[PDB]
Design an enzyme around this catalytic site. Structure first.
Site, PDB file in Angstrom:
ATOM      1  CG  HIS A  14      -0.421  -0.047   2.867  1.00  0.00           C
ATOM      2  ND1 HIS A  14      -0.040   1.103   3.468  1.00  0.00           N
ATOM      3  CD2 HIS A  14      -0.250  -1.601   3.586  1.00  0.00           C
ATOM      4  CE1 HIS A  14      -0.155   0.225   4.508  1.00  0.00           C
ATOM      5  NE2 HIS A  14      -0.040  -0.681   4.270  1.00  0.00           N
ATOM      6  CB  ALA A  15      -0.073   4.734   1.309  1.00  0.00           C
TER       7      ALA A  15
END
Lengths: 87, 87
Positions: A14-15
């Site tokens: 993810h981010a």
């Protein structure tokens, strides 16, 4: 040069994880690429990492190529372990 | 800024088309990106471009942000059209 890892991070890549990855890779004179299922993206852009949608349990390959490839690869594996992203 | 196009290349966005896009995008300082059905990659990345597997008939959007993003864009529309990739 190339190394395969298993993603163990809970929300996959993810981010935050794409960022710690781009960040490290960005320090090297080497072209750095990320591969999952036949799809490859340049690792020095979070855009294309986010796009692969890599989840926990996946296996991915990191390759580096150029003047600084051994160091580039060794650093990335250090971030993968240290940031609890994979192994 | 952005521009959307329609791919009309019979083979979609294959190695040759990806090559012309990338060479064009690379002459500009603006950050340049390609988006297709929700996935975004850096347009200066041949790998990421091929990863998308854009086939004939799809719609894609090209984005350019920065200093020379109007010229980056006109330039990409021009390639889109003269290289027979889309319109």
């Amino acid at each position: 040069a190339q190394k395969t890892f298993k993603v163990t991070a809970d929300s996959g890549i993810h981010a935050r994880p794409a960022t710690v990855l781009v960040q490290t890779a960005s320090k090297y004179d080497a072209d750095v690429n990320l591969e999952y299922n036949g799809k490859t993206v340049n690792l020095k852009d979070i855009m294309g990492v986010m796009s692969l949608g890599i989840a926990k349990g996946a296996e991915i390959t990191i390759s580096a190529s150029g003047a600084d490839e051994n160091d580039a690869l060794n650093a990335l594996e250090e971030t993968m372990k240290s940031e609890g992203l994979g192994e």
